[PDB]
Design a protein around this ligand. Structure first.
Ligand SMILES: CC(=O)N[C@H]1[C@H]2OC[C@](CO)(O2)[C@H](O)[C@@H]1O
Ligand SMILES: CC(=O)N[C@H]1[C@H]2OC[C@](CO)(O2)[C@H](O)[C@@H]1O
Ligand SMILES: [Ca+2]
Ligand SMILES: [Ca+2]
Ligand SMILES: [Ca+2]
Ligand SMILES: [Ca+2]
Ligand SMILES: [Ca+2]
Ligand SMILES: [Ca+2]
Ligand SMILES: [Cl-]
Lengths: 130, 129
């Protein structure tokens, strides 16, 4: 019916914006503990709203290809859904030399998306639907 | 003898990762091997590690998570070798990831920086023969 304290209501969704960083899997588990999920972006207006609140900061979202194809954490279909990748992304870059490609999506400093190493610590956003 | 895939140098055995881990994960990996994250105590050891890692950010066994700077094997920091980059350590909070910077790594020129412990970097394990 309503969002918990320190959460922001927007278009029937509640959002919590971290002010600290976590590896993607740890951010994912943090959102689950709160009965939420990492933010799932399905429109230009929702993208604009998230971008306004995070500012120019690398921030994890609930999109990954750890099991093969790109998937949203709540089952929202990727192929038929909203996409806002940065130019030349996703690229599954191995050149970071950290092992593996890049399997986790994050907003970049301009809001557009990048795939990065899931173990990098970034700020994240939780979302729950009313 | 050092184990297979380890490099012998001046009575120590070293293992150089080709993948990255958060400092506590790298620390756990080295202990599993009855080793410890590399402890650098001389200019010759520093030059040796530098040669094998190249210009890559790499964790070492030096941290200030519990207060003062400490080497993982109990080697005294104050009286020991130091090779910090200029203006380092700085315990930078500006990364916005939470806390300052408590873990030391070699930088692209071999000199040390303190950084966020949860950052995935390559690492070096060391064991003494
Ligand atoms: C934070 C960020 O945007 N990283 C990107 C960028 O840095 C290297 C790379 C390939 O050039 O582009 C690779 O795609 C990374 O994932
Ligand atoms: C990889 C690396 O050397 N990072 C450093 C460098 O980047 C930001 C900072 C302060 O400006 O300097 C801070 O000291 C970081 O720890
Ligand atoms: Ca949503
Ligand atoms: Ca990938
Ligand atoms: Ca990428
Ligand atoms: Ca040593
Ligand atoms: Ca510190
Ligand atoms: Ca620093
Ligand atoms: Cl990082």
């Amino acid at each position: 019916t309503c969002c918990p304290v320190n959460w922001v209501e927007h278009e029937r969704s509640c959002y919590w914006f971290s002010r600290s960083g976590k590896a993607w899997a740890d951010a994912d588990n943090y959102c689950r503990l709160e009965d939420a999920h990492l933010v799932v972006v399905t429109s230009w207006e929702e993208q604009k709203f998230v971008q306004h609140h995070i500012g120019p900061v690398n921030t994890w979202m609930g999109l990954h290809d750890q099991n093969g194809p790109w998937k949203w954490v709540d089952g929202t279909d990727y192929e038929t859904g909203f996409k806002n990748w940065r130019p030349e992304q996703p690229d599954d870059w191995y050149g970071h030399g950290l092992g593996g490609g890049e399997d986790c999506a994050h907003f970049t400093d301009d809001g557009r998306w990048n795939d990065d190493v899931c173990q990098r610590p970034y700020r994240w956003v939780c979302e729950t639907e009313l």
